[PDB]
Design brief:
One of its GO terms (molecular function) is transferase activity, transferring alkyl or aryl (other than methyl) groups. By secondary structure, the protein is α+β, with helices and mostly antiparallel strands. It is built from twelve helices and ten strands. It binds (2R)-2-hydroxy-3-(4-hydroxyphenyl)propanoic acid. (2R)-2-hydroxy-3-(4-hydroxyphenyl)propanoic acid binds at residues 163, 177, 218, 236, 238, 269, 284, 295, 300.
Length: 316
């Protein structure tokens, strides 16, 4: 239009440019778009995106959603806000576990938000504020007996501290984020992979995941919140530079190429997800608000850096 403003090219979060980039990136990777829903998310959580690290995610699954996420600096009840805005059932059965988890340690945990371009509110992510004993997370009364039962299987693998938990609002499951004292080796990999029910992989799949883990490693476990079944596990490598990337699916290569990053220090994340329904690769990519800074503040370890958790080692 005859004096329509140019979308900025600088680093600072701009909401109108975000809307355009969500649309462009969904199109670029062949993902679905929900215009109205996307506008509702952007209106409800504008400040969260502005003040946190806003970033992208997808998986190598064909046609999978283009997701967009805020990692929070502004601490507030994002779940209540989601419900106010019409983005989440007020009767969702996972609300009780999310409130329990959020209320721990006198309310220290901080919620972040994970959305899909085609489907709206996807996940609520909880940073718990340090290395929490797995017990504290897996034995809140809101969790049924069959979920709390899994505690002992985790402790038996030396997966004894939890750093994050992410509730999936379509599937009444949670991804629980552990840090193990490593190095991660072949046998520890196999014992973790075995939880998923996935067919054992060839030796080079494992060798490659092991080459990209920090010494003290982060692994997410997908837990059905009714049955306690484990569907999936996922091993993460954070801030992998483009010239050091592992072998990736062409869909992930495309994603990393087309999704824009405006951060001073670019941040790509690669997850190797293994699961009974099929393996895949997850990718995340920085957009605005300094993803790397948030992750370092959480005491995450970056590819190529020392990767030793001293506090953890004093506890084990
Ligand atoms: C894990 O790698 C989990 C993880 C994965 C992606 C992002 O962005 C943050 C955290 C960890 O280091 O705790």
């Amino acid at each position: 239009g005859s004096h329509m403003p140019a979308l900025p090219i600088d680093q600072e979060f701009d909401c109108e440019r975000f809307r355009a980039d969500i649309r462009a990136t969904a199109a670029a990777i062949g993902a679905p778009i929900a215009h109205r829903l996307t506008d509702t998310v952007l209106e409800a959580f504008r400040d969260n995106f502005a003040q946190g690290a806003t970033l992208w995610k997808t998986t190598s699954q064909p046609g999978d959603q283009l997701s967009y996420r805020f990692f929070s600096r502004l601490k507030m009840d994002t779940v209540s806000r989601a419900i106010d805005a019409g983005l989440l059932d007020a009767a969702h059965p996972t609300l009780a576990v999310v409130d329990a988890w959020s209320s721990l340690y006198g309310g220290a945990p901080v919620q972040s938000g994970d959305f899909d371009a085609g489907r709206g509110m996807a996940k609520t992510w909880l940073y718990f504020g340090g290395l929490r004993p797995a017990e504290d997370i897996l034995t809140v009364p809101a969790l049924p007996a069959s979920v709390q039962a899994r505690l002992k299987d985790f402790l038996a693998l030396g997966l004894a501290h939890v750093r994050f938990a992410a509730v999936d609002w379509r599937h009444h499951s949670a991804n629980v984020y552990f840090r193990g004292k490593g190095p991660l080796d072949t046998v520890q990999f196999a014992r973790i992979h075995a939880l998923s029910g996935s067919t054992p992989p060839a030796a080079h799949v494992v060798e490659e995941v092991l080459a990209y883990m920090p010494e003290d490693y982060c692994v997410a476990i997908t837990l059905d919140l009714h049955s306690g079944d484990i569907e999936r596990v996922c091993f993460y490598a954070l801030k992998v530079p483009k010239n050091a990337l592992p072998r990736i699916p062409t869909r992930i290569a495309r994603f990393l190429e087309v999704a824009p990053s405006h951060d001073v220090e670019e941040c790509n994340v690669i997850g190797w997800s293994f699961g009974r329904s099929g393996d895949y690769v997850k990718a995340e990519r920085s957009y605005t608000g300094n993803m790397a800074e948030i992750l370092a503040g959480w005491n995450c370890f970056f590819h190529g850096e020392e990767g030793r958790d001293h506090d953890l080692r004093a506890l084990h």
